[PDB]
Amino acid sequence: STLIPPPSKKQKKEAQLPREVAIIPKDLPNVSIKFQALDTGDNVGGALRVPGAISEKQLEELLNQLNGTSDDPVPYTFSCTKTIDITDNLYSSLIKPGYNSTEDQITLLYTPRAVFKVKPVTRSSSAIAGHGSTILCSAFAPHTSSRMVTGAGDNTARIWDCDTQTPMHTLKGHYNWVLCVSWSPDGEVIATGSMDNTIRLWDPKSGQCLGDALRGHSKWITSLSWEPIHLVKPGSKPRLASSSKDGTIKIWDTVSRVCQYTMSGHTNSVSCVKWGGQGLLYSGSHDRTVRVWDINSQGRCINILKSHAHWVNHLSLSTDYALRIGAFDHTGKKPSTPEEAQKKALENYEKICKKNGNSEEMMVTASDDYTMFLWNPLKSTKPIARMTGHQKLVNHVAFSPDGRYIVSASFDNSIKLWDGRDGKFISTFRGHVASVYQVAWSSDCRLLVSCSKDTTLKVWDVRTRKLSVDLPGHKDEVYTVDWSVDGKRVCSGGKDKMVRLWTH
Amino acid sequence: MQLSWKDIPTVAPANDLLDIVLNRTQRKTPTVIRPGFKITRIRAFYMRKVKYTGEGFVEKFEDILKGFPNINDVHPFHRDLMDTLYEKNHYKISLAAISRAKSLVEQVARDYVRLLKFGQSLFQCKQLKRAALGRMATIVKKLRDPLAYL
Amino acid sequence: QDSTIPDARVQPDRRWFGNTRVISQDALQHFRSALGETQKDTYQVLLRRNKLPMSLLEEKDADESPKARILDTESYADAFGPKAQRKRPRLAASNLEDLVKATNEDITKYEEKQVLDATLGLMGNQEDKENGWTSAAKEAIFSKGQSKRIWNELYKVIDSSDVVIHVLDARDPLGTRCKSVE
Amino acid sequence: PQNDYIERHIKQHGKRLDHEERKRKREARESHKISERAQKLTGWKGKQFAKKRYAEKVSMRKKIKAHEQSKVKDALPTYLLDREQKFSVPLPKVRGISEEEMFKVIKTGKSRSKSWKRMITKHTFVGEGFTRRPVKMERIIRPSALRQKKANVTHPELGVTVFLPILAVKKNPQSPMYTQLGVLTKGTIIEVNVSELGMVTAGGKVVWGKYAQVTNEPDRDGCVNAVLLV
Amino acid sequence: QFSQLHTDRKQISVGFIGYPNTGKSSIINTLRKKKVCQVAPIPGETKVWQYITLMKRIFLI
RNA sequence: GCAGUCAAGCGUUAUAGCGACAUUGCUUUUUGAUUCGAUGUCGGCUCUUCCUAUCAUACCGAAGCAGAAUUCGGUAAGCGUUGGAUUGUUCACCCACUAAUAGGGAACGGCUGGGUUUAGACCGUCGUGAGACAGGUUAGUUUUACCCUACUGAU
């Protein structure tokens, strides 16, 4: 093992020299500060003088009192513009470095955060067998973190109980490899798209198959998306959008088990399909284009975005977390009525959608031309931003659940973190020695997990922009990774025919 | 300006170019060497083979590269017309592939002449010469599509 | 110069199949951070270089990505020829006003570059060939110091030297510097 | 003339009056011509003709087989499809190389009477921080043209070959003296840098150094080929 | 100082390089305090390498 | 070259083992950008002949070969294939003329410079020394023919 250089004699003497104690001066004068919103660019209170020994919690309570929401506060994070966050207290954050003096003003950018915290996953719960071939896809249930669906190369899917780390149900309807799996946002049905050009629906509680397989695609299924709950009218079940290698996107009504629309604008294989929150569908394909279709207009393509020079491998929406979660939250509570479920899903979606004046649904496309494009398809047709810097193809891209960050995992053994609104470059996550396949955020947008070709998972802290923990244990390549809604478990699967569960 | 580019020599395909250059080496250089001769004579024989083959490949590549117009340097009307007709990206990529192949052939020739300085027997010198010619041939075989396009 | 033929064998052993060098993630992070904080002094010389995985350590953020490899999507045969399937430009112009603005700009830049090269090259090399005038052959004395024999001697002395002294003329020290050798 | 003027001329005036008949008779004569060439061409041209005939017959048989076959009628993820690529050593015993073949006698002196200097005729790895001994005290000579720094290493698993830097020489099978001199011959165990192979231990350590065995003669073919011992 | 830094090498060599007629031979003669290297105003007087022993552990080339 | 793939065959009744033609990876990545140790034999002058693996000249075949020019190839050795610069090296490289400035053998299994150059001398490295060399510089007598044969002419 290669070791770091040892300390020298002079360094040992310096260490044995007495240390300095970071103490708060009692004669610390007041500092003039001005608040400013990161999202809206609005100032509250103007120039206000605050003591030098003010804590972050006391500053948070003061800001809540200024806003007038002392009864129901919402925790905020503060930064000062280099832009440096407020870790513990103002003196140790800004005055102790000496960049800003006491006489100067402090412009504090405040940003809302999550009430709860997710602990990082530090160890492997169990290595569960049962799949006869390599694992191809996996997902967690939206309502609970005790249910995981996993589709593999033995023509089967499996429902695993994550509480006991034991198999629960076997789903053996398909004929070829189960390429993709998905859970309904209301948690009622699992949809699996296979290599035999078929789609199947499964009741998870009984481990059973609903009717016959969905047929009509002439090539294998590439991606499955569900209609959002906040757009689904109460008393009806959400529809299922499916893409495939043949270049067509089919829409399925599961209530009547029919196909309603068959969009066919792409000249090449469709990489992915996403059902957005404003009644639109976004499709990415190997013809270097992105097609925006309107569901409400008989599946007519609203727009064609052409700015990439290669296959668009993936695309992501700002509200993807809310779209996948529906009405459920991290507490796992279930609404009593379908009307209540639709209303709560609408509120959860609007929390990300409508902010700083006008509601927007940003899209990001990661392509094989080593780049990404950031679009706002509702307002403009030109791309809002171009993200460059990856030296190889960008395989995965993910918006943070709050929509304030973008993460791109590339084949150059690297991950990149970009700003979510303007698309400017923030940081690079390094530590993988093989190509990164896919990535997954945590619920509070503070932790990230990535799986790589080097048989490892890595958990990164987004705030400090460093590697939090390294998780080995897979004997071969890892293909799928997912993080639960409540932030308690992480599932991983790959060539070793084993499902690895990770917890704190 | 130039206004006309009919004076470009014929571009042979990869296998035909290989046959032309290798058979030129075989015809135009002496071919009899004996194991009973001095080791300096043997080394000079195989050095001449390697150097002559490299020069032949390089001169064919240079004839290709000098004849074709510079798409960026010509008048904008000619540049737009040739971009419409021939896809400027493919045009420049093919010519750059020719240039890279020329540099690689030169490098192989220099390296193997230097290695042949230390040959100790006819068998070793013959193996080194065959290795140099085979590496050049692999470089040339990697240009099949750009040569046909050009 | 012994002529006996040795018995060259490699015995079976499990030491051949184990990892010989490994590095931890913490050590990789430490060396990645240290590469960048180094402040080289002119009066410090390198006595012994530490053995490190420099391929894993030499990671630098880059603002721009390399160009997309167009041959993967479109081949030469589909680009041009009897079997060509390209019928439209890859990137069409936005509109005719932008097209004519771009062409006028290109005409202006071409004329500026033609004037800039007509200042020197056309009044130099091109005009001489019309009258049949050729420059005299370059003298062989001016290539002294560039022979393969001399440069072989130079590489010999460098390979034999622990300390190399580069001697400069105080009258023209930048003129007498061997930057390529350095 | 401009554009496709020969085709326009053919469209406007036709061809020569006997063009079709002449072409038909030449194509009928082609079989006799091929047989006469096969029986008449001598030397290198004849050998090349026979080789090309064999290749053409093989290609024709493959085309017939493919047509008849057509007339009769790894579990990768979605983002990876539509994309392409005992403790015994593989060479337990290699050819013995004597010192007479390994070393060349270098004579010194004005009358060439001293013969104490020796030159290694094989490819070597000298390592980092190498400086030549002073010429008066330099007995063993390893010329710079024969020094190697990298090798083409083939991985048995995953079936790839990578150009890797050489770290050390572990065991030359001929002799420990050749091992310490750094001689790269067939069957030599070397140490290679495998950082770009992305190997991780079961404990999370990044592997960047392993063993490989040289499987060719770099003195003969001018390069070092090795098999990684996994 | 360089010799002391390489005290484990048993000897060090210092090679003089540069443009023709810059004075490498003159500098070596200055260090030896004796005309051991031939010197001329015409460029190219020195044609091959030459070893000079300055001290027991220091050679000049 | 190494490692692998395929399969016309060969082998077999144990889908063991060989294996032509093809083909992949490394060497070597896309926008025509920008000298690294020959350890023991070399070059001239004069002059003849031979080979063809043909550079030019003769005649042909093919090619988007319009014309002009050029490229590849076939028969072909009848006939030609140059003048110079450069030794702080040239196991070559430039300038020009030219129809063209093709390759090679009969040595490398007479004058003449490099070279086996012995005695004089100096510098450098090594050796306690006699001396030797990692080396560098300079100066240094070998002198048939009228014999036989061959060849050229003459009785």
Ligand SMILES: Nc1nc2c(ncn2[C@@H]2O[C@H](COP(=O)(O)OP(=O)(O)OP(=O)(O)O)[C@@H](O)[C@H]2O)c(=O)[nH]1
């Ligand atoms: N004025 C002055 N002249 C110097 C000095 N050093 C060298 N010279 C002169 O410069 C000329 C070059 O001397 P060299 O010692 O032969 O220089 P070099 O670099 O060894 O040149 P080459 O051996 O030919 O490559 C000599 O005539 C010296 O007299 C100096 O320090 N001052």
Ligand SMILES: [K+]
């Ligand atoms: K001088």
Ligand SMILES: [Mg+2]
């Ligand atoms: Mg000098």
Ligand SMILES: [Mg+2]
């Ligand atoms: Mg002939």
Ligand SMILES: [Mg+2]
């Ligand atoms: Mg003498």
